[PDB]
Amino acid sequence: YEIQRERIELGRCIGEGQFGDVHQGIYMSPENPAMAVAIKTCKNCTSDSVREKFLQEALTMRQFDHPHIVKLIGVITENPVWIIMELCTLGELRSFLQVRKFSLDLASLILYAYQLSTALAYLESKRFVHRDIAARNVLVSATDCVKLGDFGLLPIKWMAPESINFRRFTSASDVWMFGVCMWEILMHGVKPFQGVKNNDVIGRIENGERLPMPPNCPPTLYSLMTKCWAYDPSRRPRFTELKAQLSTILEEEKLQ
Ligand SMILES: COc1cc(N2CCN(C)CC2)ccc1/N=C1/N=CC(Cl)C(Nc2cccc3c2C(=O)N(C)C3)=N1
């Protein structure tokens, strides 16, 4: 996975992760060429300690291969250390949904939910627990394609009650988080529990309260969300079940 630095043309800064800035760029391999890529940079990889955990995040992504998860292209392991990722040209999902609120059809929103469910069913089949499903971690590759962002790049308001209370994390706790992510998508990138203190979230959940039906959301889809938010994790659908139900909701919408 090692790439020669001279095969990367560093371009405009697009975002920023924990370790440092993220740039867009061009990767020239004798196989494409001129491939658009994202370049993750690291502040102070002069420090050898932060380089090891920075590069460990690339290894994380190496194990996955799915159309709706961003792909690792390679790494440049000498200073400055770079991780080369697939570029999702349209950027962060939340911003995308906010700017395009009155331009995106419902069919598109449901499509994004469905695509994410395929990625998450894949992760569930790999026995991989994500722990951080939220619209903030989704990228837009095309107007008809979203992808789970880099897993390297507490979220109480997204978390299942058993995660908040007892730090239990399972694929069923991921399902709860995905329910919240679906709500965010159908709300056009509004965050859940606005104006609510983190410490107050579990009290609301335990009171039976739930995020309300988004304006214009099909009741079948809202019903699906509420199934993700069963208090008892064993009562929540698996991601493969969500995928199947989202397929039908999408097909019905495409129809009207
Ligand atoms: C032009 O492509 C873009 C553009 C942006 N922005 C454009 C300029 N905005 C002012 C800020 C954000 C943000 C992201 C982006 N595309 C990618 N494509 C791939 C990857 Cl890995 C990536 N990385 C992120 C870049 C920024 C935020 C996040 C990223 C991420 O992976 N997560 C989970 C959050 N971003």
Overall number of structural domains: 2
Query: In the CATH hierarchy, what is the superfamily of the largest domain?
Result: Transferase(Phosphotransferase) domain 1
Structural class: alpha+beta
Classified by CATH, the class of the largest domain is: Mainly Alpha
- Alpha-carbon Rg, integer: 19 Å
Q: Report strand order across the widest sheet.
A: 1-2-3-5-4
Portion in helices: 25-40%
What best-fitting shape do the alpha-carbon axes yield? globular
N-end to C-end Cα span: 46 Å
What is the number of beta strands? 8
List the ions, cofactors and other small molecules found in this model.
ligand BIJ
SSE topology sketch:
Blueprint: E1 8-16, E2 21-27, E3 35-41, H1 48-62, E4 72-76, E5 82-86, E6 91-92, H2 93-99, H3 106-125, E7 138-142, E8 145-148, H4 161-166, H5 171-186, H6 201-206, H7 219-228, H8 239-255
Antiparallel strand pairs: 1-2, 2-3, 3-5, 4-5, 6-7, 7-8
Helix pairs in contact: 3-5, 3-8, 5-7
Bound molecules: the ligand COc1cc(N2CCN(C)CC2)ccc1/N=C1/N=CC(Cl)C(Nc2cccc3c2C(=O)N(C)C3)=N1.
Organism: Gallus gallus
Family: Belongs to the protein kinase superfamily. Tyr protein kinase family. FAK subfamily.
GO molecular function, one term: non-membrane spanning protein tyrosine kinase activity
Quick tags:
38% helix, 256 residues, alpha+beta, 5-stranded antiparallel beta sheet, Phosphorylase Kinase, domain 1, 2 domains, binds ligand BIJ
